[PDB]
Write a protein that binds this DNA or RNA. Sequence first.
DNA 1: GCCGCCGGTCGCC
DNA 2: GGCGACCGGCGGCC
Lengths: 286, 290, 291, 291, 291, 292
Amino acid sequence: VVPFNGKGTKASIKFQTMVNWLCENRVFTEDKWKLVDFNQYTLLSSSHSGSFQIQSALKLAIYKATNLVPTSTFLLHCIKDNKIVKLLLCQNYDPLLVGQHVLKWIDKKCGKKNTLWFYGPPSTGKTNLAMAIAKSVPVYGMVNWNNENFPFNDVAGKSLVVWDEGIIKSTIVEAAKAILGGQPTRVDQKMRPGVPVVITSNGDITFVVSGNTTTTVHAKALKERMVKLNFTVRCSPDMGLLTEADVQQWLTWCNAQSWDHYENWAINYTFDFPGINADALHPDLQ
Amino acid sequence: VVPFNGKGTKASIKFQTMVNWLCENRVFTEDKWKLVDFNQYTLLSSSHSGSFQIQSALKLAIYKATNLVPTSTFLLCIKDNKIVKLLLCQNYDPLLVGQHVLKWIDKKCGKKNTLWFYGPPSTGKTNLAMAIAKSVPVYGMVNWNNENFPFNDVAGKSLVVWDEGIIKSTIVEAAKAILGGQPTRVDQKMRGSVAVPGVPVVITSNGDITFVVSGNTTTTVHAKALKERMVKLNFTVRCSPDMGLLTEADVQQWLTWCNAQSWDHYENWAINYTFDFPGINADALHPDLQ
Amino acid sequence: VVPFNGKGTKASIKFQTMVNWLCENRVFTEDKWKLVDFNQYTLLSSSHSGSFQIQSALKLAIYKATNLVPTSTFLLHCIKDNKIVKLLLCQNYDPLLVGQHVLKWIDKKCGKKNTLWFYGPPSTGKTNLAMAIAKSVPVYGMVNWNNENFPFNDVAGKSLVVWDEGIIKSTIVEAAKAILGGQPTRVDQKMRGSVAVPGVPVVITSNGDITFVVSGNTTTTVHAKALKERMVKLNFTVRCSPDMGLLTEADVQQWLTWCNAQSWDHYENWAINYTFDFPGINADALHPDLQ
Amino acid sequence: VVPFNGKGTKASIKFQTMVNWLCENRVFTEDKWKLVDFNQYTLLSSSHSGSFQIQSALKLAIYKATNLVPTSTFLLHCIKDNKIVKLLLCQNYDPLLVGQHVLKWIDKKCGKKNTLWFYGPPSTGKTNLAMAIAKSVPVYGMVNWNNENFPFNDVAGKSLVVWDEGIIKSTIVEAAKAILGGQPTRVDQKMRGSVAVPGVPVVITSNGDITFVVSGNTTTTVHAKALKERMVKLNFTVRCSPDMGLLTEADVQQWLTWCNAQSWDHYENWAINYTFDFPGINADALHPDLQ
Amino acid sequence: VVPFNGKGTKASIKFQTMVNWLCENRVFTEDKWKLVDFNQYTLLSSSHSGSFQIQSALKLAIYKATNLVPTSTFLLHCIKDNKIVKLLLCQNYDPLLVGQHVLKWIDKKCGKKNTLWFYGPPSTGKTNLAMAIAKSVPVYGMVNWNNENFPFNDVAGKSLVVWDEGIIKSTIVEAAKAILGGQPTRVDQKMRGSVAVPGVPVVITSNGDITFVVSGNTTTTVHAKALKERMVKLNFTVRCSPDMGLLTEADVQQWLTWCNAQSWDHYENWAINYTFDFPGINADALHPDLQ
Amino acid sequence: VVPFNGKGTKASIKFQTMVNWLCENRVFTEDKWKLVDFNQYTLLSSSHSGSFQIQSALKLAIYKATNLVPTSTFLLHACIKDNKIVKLLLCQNYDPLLVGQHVLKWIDKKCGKKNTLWFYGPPSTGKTNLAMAIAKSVPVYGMVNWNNENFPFNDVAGKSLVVWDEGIIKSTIVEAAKAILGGQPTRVDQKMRGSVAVPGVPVVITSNGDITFVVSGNTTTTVHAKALKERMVKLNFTVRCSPDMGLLTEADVQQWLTWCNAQSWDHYENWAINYTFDFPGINADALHPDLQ
DNA sequence: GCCGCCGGTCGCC
DNA sequence: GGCGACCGGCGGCC
Ligand SMILES: Nc1ncnc2c1ncn2[C@@H]1O[C@H](COP(=O)(O)OP(=O)(O)NP(=O)(O)O)[C@@H](O)[C@H]1O
Ligand SMILES: Nc1ncnc2c1ncn2[C@@H]1O[C@H](COP(=O)(O)OP(=O)(O)NP(=O)(O)O)[C@@H](O)[C@H]1O
Ligand SMILES: Nc1ncnc2c1ncn2[C@@H]1O[C@H](COP(=O)(O)OP(=O)(O)NP(=O)(O)O)[C@@H](O)[C@H]1O
Ligand SMILES: Nc1ncnc2c1ncn2[C@@H]1O[C@H](COP(=O)(O)OP(=O)(O)NP(=O)(O)O)[C@@H](O)[C@H]1O
Ligand SMILES: Nc1ncnc2c1ncn2[C@@H]1O[C@H](COP(=O)(O)OP(=O)(O)NP(=O)(O)O)[C@@H](O)[C@H]1O
Ligand SMILES: Nc1ncnc2c1ncn2[C@@H]1O[C@H](COP(=O)(O)OP(=O)(O)NP(=O)(O)O)[C@@H](O)[C@H]1O
Ligand SMILES: [Mg+2]
Ligand SMILES: [Mg+2]
Ligand SMILES: [Mg+2]
């Protein structure tokens, strides 16, 4: 399709450059814009025609960073020295395979398996790793911030949805089957792609509370849409916060490795994530 | 009736050209506009006025594509077409089916405004319906609408799709009007006349929809009335588990070939419309498909 | 009343010319404007000013076509070969006397009797003649469109009100009497602001008697006296052959033009005291051409 | 005090002239403006600024004609030929005193006695006289048009209030005392930021005694003392000819103008202390123009 | 806190001059503006951008007159012929102390004794005196105008709150205690910046003791001690002449002009220990002009 | 981060200068602006354009004062024996050095979990006077008594200090109380502002009785007593004061905090390693000769 | 105050 | 006389 013949003025080209600048520096919120470049914000807020451009540029930047650009490219920029590499080795999970899956999972290339699940005892580092990814993607949203009876508001536009210490109520289970499966909401269909979801919890989430009693009616359907990871070993208190770079170096290194190994397991996506294969451990990871 | 003797400035001519450019490339949604041409959208959205124009152009393009141009214009060797292969296995005449579709999609079938596909599951009922629905500019599903108000925003659509639907006794009164091509009161009260918009309808189902659900029971009072407005097809043959997603290109090829052939056979059946679509006539098969 | 001494730029003259064109070409809805002239609509819809001018011009054209010009001028333009003339003769009715009645009724000059009633067996063409007149006037409103509990909405700014198969309920019989009698609605008395507001002609086609107002689950005849004061009745008893086809506004314009061309004293004799029932064909009084 | 030493631009002076012209020709509604001058109305409504100017100018003209200018100026321009003059002789009322009393009453000069009451048998012309006077003043409202539960809404901005065949209810008896006595509502107090501003003349017509306020399904005389002080009572005892016809503003203006030139000193002989019942004709008090 | 430089253009300078002219001639309401300078109001309403300036200027003028100017300056410009001086002597109170106290009171300088209370039999002129003071401040409000369940709304933006024929109920005792004592309401606290001060003076007229709180169908005295500390009580016992007439600004300002010129020693001696009652005439200290 | 290479007109530079001027003069409300400078306010409100500029300037100035500039810089300034606050602290048996130094960290949200100060003691001992003295120095603060009874924590965001005077905690709102008193932002704060974490507002509480006991109907419950103790710091005002010490002023606060900033921080670092619910009292020998 | 458009008039055909 | 493109004016925008 041939684009239109419209030629813009100086102001329009300046606005387009401003949108590119906002998209490049990951400035998607007013607070972030004030914290980063207060001078330009003060200059723009002087009048109506300046204030409107702020909202327009923010919306266009969000759309460009979410829909028109692959999210994985936002994450890609001594492999053994990375904290995350050691952490997955302790949990007997191959750092390479889990890294490759995240790239496909964030890129909606895993089919119906749109949801990741971290399972283990409390204080094993589940939320620390999960929250590290949420700070690496352009925009993220948490279920906890939403209303108690409307947990899935403002799902469209997010690069990732995080559900920390969550549990599924039978009154809203039908909505969970859609989003966790990646099916678009009916509102999205009417007005016009799914959003990856990550869930961390202490118990078994496949059990659904129904009244004052637990039930297993929906246990079968939720299993196909999810991948389970076991974080059993307690973490030392000195680990601290995981930096966005630690994710960046880990994902970038895993990207360049041979991909054919991941495709073999990708033929039949199992609900359970396979453990470390000692015969396939990379030499640099040792 | 003479067009007004006004003259357009250089600014309005650009808007008029953009309106034609919208219809030329079948872009009718803001998402499609963003996906196809981002630079022009970004340039337009940097000024109060620069926006009033996006919505105005979209509205004008929708109206022009839906009402001022025949729908079939958007649709217009043959043995290799998957659509023909589909209807061949289903014991129906591939040529005669398309010739009715063109008259049906153009609101030229009188009271029989509704088409119905029926059969066991995994027989291609839904795949064929979406292939037609993708080709038309604008289409809407009854599934997306509210349960208590299934017929909202029917106007402005070139087609309406109803997937695995069931008719309830509460909505049987509104269903009869929309399925029969009769204009709704909302359009009548707005437009000014008593008959204007026109909406084709296509329905798929695994069960007989002529039966109406009332309470926890099923009645047959409205069966005769719904039979007049509808046309039935029986997809009773299991399809080969190899066929893929039917595309608009497949439909356009099927309709283009069927359009130019002889139209002498169709109008004989058009004198009296049978409730069931006629099946394969062995002697009347076109020599191309023998 | 000397007009104002104001003056306006070329844009205002263009707007006035556009309003005059809308009045001339009989365009009164946005969809009609889109159908007749898409180019001018697309040019006008390029900015806020044009989109406001569209609504202003539409409203002004509607007002001019409704209140600034007598409705009869929108109807004027072998007489025996006219389909409508045959129909009234078949129904044993004089075409001239009916036509001359319409030209005074459509202009609200008949006073209290603002309503015509078409009554008789079904499928005799009662709706066909009623709708034919409606399609000729600038704009008409139908009671069937309006909501269940509020039938008399959107009456203002209309030329003709059509009500087919109508039944008067006791709940709304009081509001019904106002419009059917030519009395103005009370909201127009204040929104316009004095008792100078006019009313709208009403035409009713029914298969049964409408003087029997429905109350609950029982028929009552207390209101029959008041309704008969305001109404004129016709009887479509003789069913027509199913080959008359859809009547056209050209037939109405042709028939109405001929009626005004003849003598008017013939109708004036019956105008001294209007009768509820319409007198039938008189062989002596028939027009020389129609014989 | 000396007003602001401003300098009106070219456009603003046009607005001032338009506002003056609207007041001059008594054009107070959009529907009146369309009939009087459609040209200027279209030229103005050609754009947003013109519509805003129309909306502002209408309110300014209403304010100028209501508050800043006395109403009597629009009433003031042999006498035996006047219809109204003969009418009051039938009801044994002196036309001169009635004319003089109305002129002082319309401008809120009577103080407490702010209400005039017409009473008598039906068909004596009680409504005919009230309507003619009402349509002479620029803007008037009717209690009938207003909401049943809120009959005294939209009081401000009216030069006269007309109440036909009214009956006072116990639910609204308290609000009626203020309006009939010229007491402004709290809206005219707190939003107009004072204790009292308008005078809102009110006229009432009835066939029975309105001082008997209905209480539930019973009649009570508690409020008889309070209301009878606020009103002035006129009795239309004699039924007039059926062919009196509709009165017009021309008859109203001529009658008031003639009463203006006559002697005034006779009026205040009684006006120092009004009585509830209007005094009748005495042969001595009859002017020679009517003898 | 040196002012910003901000060199303004002629458009803003003219608006500032208009704002000053508003305060100078006491034009604080739209109705007063229309009644005083109609030409300027007509010119200003010719456009939307000109109509916005009226609402911009009125608020600033009201704020300037309320907070940026001492209220007593609006009061201060033979003596033995002033009606108030004569009236206060009839009640056996010293006019000089009353006038001196009022000026100190209106500027909120009495401390916690913010509210004045006038009590006595009817027809003693209590209400007439209260109106004269309220008519002289820029803007005044009433508790009578407010809603029954929320009588203490719209407190801000007023220089004096008048409560005529007042009485205190138990459902509003907590609100009345704060307002009568000068304590700012929580609205000012959450709109301005923490415990401010503006408050408002209050004047009360009553025919009965207001210290008796009405609860249910029983009179109670729980808050009698708390209320008395906040008011200064005056007993208006002597009936006044029926034909005294209303009081005006010229009477109050003339009276207040004399009082300010005298020494503050007489007042400041009693001001050290504020009493609930006000001292009467002392022949040992009556001013020579009033002897 | 390289700032966007745009350049503003004369009006934009003037507006930025006005925003700076509003910050420098501690003007944050319409009433304060009208009181300080009526002429500029009139000039701005003369037109529709300036009425929007006023609101934008105020909204930007509040944000600049609250989030961009540390609050403690508004306390420090650009006869120590005679300072009124020093005497008042000595009357109530507390070291003026440690009280001032702790404030400079509590007001800057640097104390970690212990985000609140608690004043306890009999009436008329000077609890209210000192509490309001700190508030008058910070740019903008909000007091709880203004809000609705059922909604106590409205408009908490965008304030430098939260004042709660003689208040008592109820079980119906004890769940929200542990949030602000703990320094973790409310749920709506993250959503409207994208980040799971945005620092909280310091809180100062005065009380005549022990607030660690929560009202539960017509009954006192102590289930939440433990949870409040690691969020709070307690000071006891056990000595009454004579009516010879009027309202405290910002001048006293600035002088007091200025001296506490210049002295060594070793006496604070010893206690700051492990915070205690009880604030240690006067040490007889540790008192520096500048206050002996 | 900002960026847009309609419009007049002089400049050139 | 006609066609051209230039700059200044004005728009509405809460
Ligand atoms: N705010 C923090 N500052 C420093 N270290 C932290 C912080 N939060 C967590 N950690 C460290 O991160 C590791 C685990 O963090 P945490 O988020 O509590 O893990 P978890 O297993 O997801 N916990 P839980 O929420 O109990 O399931 C430990 O080494 C902690 O010391
Ligand atoms: N992604 C796909 N979408 C549609 N059809 C598919 C797809 N993949 C394979 N097919 C095959 O294509 C044919 C179309 O089947 P489908 O249209 O889903 O059946 P149907 O009869 O309309 N189903 P039902 O919804 O039960 O009425 C079948 O043979 C499918 O097995
Ligand atoms: N599509 C049509 N359907 C029916 N009648 C038609 C049609 N087109 C033309 N006509 C003519 O219209 C005549 C009847 O018109 P119609 O208005 O339906 O009658 P009616 O007496 O008003 N009907 P009803 O509503 O049953 O009382 C027929 O006899 C035909 O001559
Ligand atoms: N066109 C006319 N309209 C009204 N009244 C007319 C007309 N022509 C003559 N009249 C007479 O003029 C008088 C007007 O009376 P009118 O004001 O309608 O009633 P009223 O005396 O107030 N009584 P009522 O309405 O019965 O309570 C009556 O005597 C009518 O007969
Ligand atoms: N029109 C008037 N306006 C004001 N004061 C008047 C007026 N006429 C007389 N007066 C004087 O005011 C006195 C009563 O006025 P008013 O202000 O109502 O007094 P009051 O003692 O406060 N009344 P009350 O409300 O009965 O307790 C009369 O006795 C006259 O001296
Ligand atoms: N504006 C003032 N007026 C009077 N006394 C004041 C004022 N400001 C301070 N004081 C005095 O300064 C001291 C401060 O006491 P304060 O801080 O109010 O004590 P408290 O125990 O918190 N009060 P309370 O509110 O009764 O619980 C007291 O002696 C007050 O009387
Ligand atoms: Mg956690
Ligand atoms: Mg299907
Ligand atoms: Mg009184």
